[PDB]
């Protein structure tokens, strides 16, 4: 449901609530939540 | 957090004017003019031009605090001469000098051919 | 938490040093009317002290802020502290100072008769 | 014409060196201050980041993009965005640029200011283009990408002056000299043994007569003959820096005149 | 009558007195000074449908009884805040409370969840000049960065002959060396004040 | 920024003439027949709004009302031209039958060029301070003078400002301008609906004694108008009772 | 981290000179002062802006990207 | 002060009656114009009628005393630059002094029939 | 640092290696990971805003990036299983079914109870959303119903801070429980009150910031990034600051790095000579001009680059005010810490300074109306605070004394009431009486 990236193999994953928080490709247990899709405003100062 | 907005160094706020003039009771025929949203760039120019006027007895300015973009210009003139009129003549002569400066720089830059 | 090399001295921290070095009548009785010293034999100064001036100004300013009648004419002054200062200046503060002597006796000195020399 | 005289010694694309005579020190310093702080310039002010997978922070890149110099020749034809009637920004008050950078190469891909692409309508004006000065054709090194890294963003460039932020300053450093022989004695020279030996002569000492060492002090002499070297960042030509500084100071004095007359006629 | 406006966007601060000096040969008289403010309101509704504008222009003339006109999507609303020009019926029937308040301050105080003020242009210390059978009326427009443009307001008390006069004023603007003026004489649909406000909107919008 | 120093009450229809005579004796002024069709507009439910405003203070949405007169030829039902317009005509108006109907009020609202003058009134809940013996309410009002354009109807103007029609009522009554600026109104209220009119003040007249003060900051003026209201109350004791109505009743905010 | 766009003191654009500075150092065999002079940095503020810059961005880039497309 | 106000009234009644006689027959008298010095007590009026060339005026300058009051008639060319009025040309050669008891509407019509020719002659 | 989830991290935008450097630091890798910038420093009494170790920084240099820094703060949270049904969970809470929700926004959270990286957050904004189950059918705070099955145990951002969510890391601990770490990134831009030090014991805060047109300037248009006061030099005898500024000037002119190792044969006369063939006054003085008027300053200014360090004491991390706020559980005095919206200590010797001033009413207002003003009832028979007071029924009674008409009202600090009750627990009777018994 929500988008995650593995720590070192950089694989994209979709996680629901009941899913265990682990990587399905290499078995690593550290996942980073994805960058938001919305545009983010920065003043150039 | 407490830093002021940097456009308030030159942008007049709501309900405030560029100029305000108060009479000065310390000396006869003298005014104090508060220039809002201006600084030393204008202050030194206007004061030094007012001091070139022979009918101006006193001309000084001060920025009382660097936090606030305003300065106070005290002008005292001879009797029968309005300090408002002295400000007008000083500003007009500054305008004329700057126009002559712009014209001279145009002519000399056009004379330059290595650019 | 915090870990800083800038030695900010722990103020009000003397108990470390404490634990380091721990080893080494005739004229007036009760509350009778005699406690009131009469006006003719008052022995205190006729001058208003700095503390008397401060508390009279504070009390009068508090009363003026809480809408007491003002016994001077106003010159456009709105702040109760300067209204109280003007009332002190031309002596229109209807208060008295009860100066307590160490034996429990007291002297009543009105603000009108006290000299404001400071 | 009668007034301040200009004698340009050296002229270049990004430098003008000139002598400014028959003028007051207040006028010369006010012109220097206006050129530093008061000339309107186009610079990137707003950054919308859609993708940033770089090693640099978002506002790091945004600050760099704000400091990128942009062409500002027709900046008077652009309008202040706070004065414009649009909601946030539009073609009348801003220039919209786009940066699209991807690491498709095995080596490090440099993201330059030449990769900024104007996507708004310029309406035939001469603003918005990043300034290229070096011979390689690249601009300022904005970022660096490893393979797989992406930087995807949109800039909104609005006009401003350098008191609001120094990114809007077009004047770099401004060399300013008067009285190279200290004939007015506005400096008292610190020395150990001999001030003339220990203090190097300036390059403008060749354009004035040296003191005769027996003549007395000239108490009537004032400060004129200002040697000024204006440098251009690149946003506007350096002669336009000087000329628009003069014009900006003139509009300030004219605004003082008009405010004075407006409250006089009330 | 009939009204029109000319807005000279790119002009000097002294263009007012220059145009007055150029028109001085035809001036019949001079009247009292006037003032005006031009407020811009943006709609802050997050979900607005298509074919609706978020712009609302609030124009307060300190002449014409100090009246404010709101313009939105070619729709005008005339509003007053003075007690002189209230109809006596609203005072007598208890709908009004004697003294009104300005719609600008009510918008900026208690209708600010819908409309937010962003731009304020104040034309103060203006002049009114009476020509031959006509009224021109000048002011310098002040946005937040000082001067914005020159404003000329054409008033005529007959409407049968107006195009020759407006062409003549445009000609005077031509020999005062101003060629990129925006001239507006459009109507709505329709009284003098609301047509004037719509003309002001069309002139000030590029 | 007006404040209405107000008291409220009610009478039956039988005591209406007795109260008219009594107030005529009190004031020395004859009663003044008046009407004001009040149309009420609430913010659009399809518009997502923010609780904050242009500044950082959070506010509630509020119903804002538009009031104007209706000519009495539109309230005469072609049967009472002969009797003059006075206080005596309010005895006939007891039931729901009013000649002003929903179709004609819709015609008035939609202007089917130029629009009639209106009064735009915005009122919050009265003050919560339980130390004033009279109901103090804050009302901000403009006078909408005229309109034009192809979209010149005042309903569509209210939609442009973002407010849709909710309900409307016609009030008809008589008022007295008595001593020192006290306006005492005595009125009937009918709700105008497409399903039919309804007499809200069923079988009686509503009483509202109010004073408008331009500066509610002027505490001396507030106290003077308040003690004028209590002087009227003391003069009216025994016959009719003046009391402060509920602030929940006088609140015009949109509930959620 | 990466070369600054402008000199801190005066605002001269120096971020376009970093690659040419490195090239003048490594393939023209110039010493650093002559390289700065050939770039045109005559004020020592502009000279130290390039001379003292420690370019840590390739040290950051040697790490694998966290989000890879 | 009463005497100064009375002499002000002396000149102002004459100014009013001359303005009335000029504006009744068709002269567009100007009050938008002011001069710092027009060269006893005197008062100037710059009269113009819009059927003869631009930027030209007739200066009617009354001079008054306790006894006798007369008026000088001159022709001038006044142009305004940057809000300041300057007399580009002054005609002190063909100047005549007449009295208010001697001026009449017929002489004003002769003045109309003369000033057009004079304005044509002055260039 | 980009892959390290440190609790606090401060990174310079543009670290610069020092112009004046030692031979020792290239084994310390100081030229590879430097901790400062070479700021052009003038030693001048310019405006009086650099006195008592204050400094004037260039606002234009600040705008162009002088001493700008990234600040990273990591917030770690866990969901733990206290029992069977008592388990914490990461979710986006809803006000309809969750009790004690914080007044900050929950809208930036996603379905997992976490904010995606890249989203701007401000103070008191919920960044980690956690709920814990509670016992149904209770009565607390009035706003309690049967729908509130959970209560909020969320982690919000620090109330004074803000920034951008840089990274969100979701993993498992040793126990297997899910736990998250949220790194939020902000930018500290230098401002008045930020602390900067040179490498010679010369600490100081920014006194004021001037723009370039207001800064003093040389004949070449060089303005300082920093003005420090001449009075910081002679008493402190930091001659090495002057020598390093001279050496850094020579190094910047020659394109080298200066050898500033301690016990070498490197002299001020040699550095001055090299500065002289670089065409400057040999002792580091330059003729500078006043920025306000353009006139030459009568004194010539010691001018040149100096290595300065941005210290981590920023004024925004230290500014703190409290009108009213939370009270401590025990003493009901203002709590400790600026992060808890706490009070400031009015200690014994601050009280003693007030005593020496003679401000008795201000002292009483500080100790009572500003910390803890507690009303308590005693009786005339025993001085104890064991008087049962029913203010709604207007009924006062003391057990034991059995008196109901001899009740006195006193205002004491809650700390004083706690002291008296602790004495009562320790079997001391601190009987408080409202009348005197013996003479003075
Ligand atoms: Mg200290
Ligand atoms: Zn993996
Ligand atoms: Zn725009
Ligand atoms: Zn530089
Ligand atoms: Zn007891
Ligand atoms: Zn209890």
Author numbering:
A (entry chain L): 26 to 70
B (entry chain K): 1 to 115
C (entry chain F): 12 to 35, 62 to 155
D (entry chain C): 3 to 268
E (entry chain f): 2 to 190, 194 to 210
F (entry chain e): 1 to 112, 159 to 302
G (entry chain J): 1 to 69
H (entry chain l): 548 to 586, 620 to 703
Provide excerpts from the study:
At gene promoters, RNA polymerase II (Pol II) assembles into a preinitiation complex (PIC) which includes the coactivator Mediator. Here, we describe the PIC-Mediator complex from yeast at unprecedented resolution and provide a reference structure for initiation complexes. Moreover, we observe three Mediator-bound fragments of the C-terminal domain (CTD) of Pol II which stabilize Mediator conformation within the PIC and significantly extend prior information from the human system. We reveal two stretches of the CTD bound between the Mediator head and middle modules, as well as one CTD stretch at the Mediator hook domain.
Single-particle cryo-electron microscopy (cryo-EM) analysis led to reconstructions of the PIC-cMed complex lacking the nucleosome and the PIC-cMed-nucleosome complex at 3.0 Å and 3.6 Å resolution, respectively. To build the PIC-cMed structure, we first fitted our previously reported atomic PIC structure into the cryo-EM map of the PIC-cMed complex. Focused refinement of cMed then led to a local resolution of 3.3 Å and enabled us to build and refine an atomic model of cMed that was based on our previous partial model. Further focused refinement yielded a high-resolution reconstruction (3.1 Å) of the central cMed region including the shoulder, knob, connector, and hook domains and permitted the localization of additional densities corresponding to parts of the Pol II CTD. The obtained high resolution of the cryo-EM map enabled us to build atomic models for three CTD regions which we refer to as “CTD peptide 1”, “CTD peptide 2”, and “CTD peptide 3”. In conclusion, we obtained an atomic model of the yeast PIC-cMed complex that includes the Mediator middle module, Med1, and three Mediator-bound CTD regions and shows very good stereochemistry. Our structure contains extended models for all middle module subunits, as well as more complete models for Med17 and the previously lacking subunit Med1. The structure provides a detailed view of the interaction between the Mediator plank and the Pol II foot domain and Rpb8, which is mediated through a hydrophobic and a polar interface. Comparison of the PIC-bound cMed structure with the free cMed crystal structure shows that the structure is largely unaltered by PIC binding, except that the middle module moved with respect to the head, leading to a more extended conformation. In contrast to the human system, the TFIIH kinase module remains flexible in the yeast structure also in the presence of Mediator and was therefore not included in the final model.
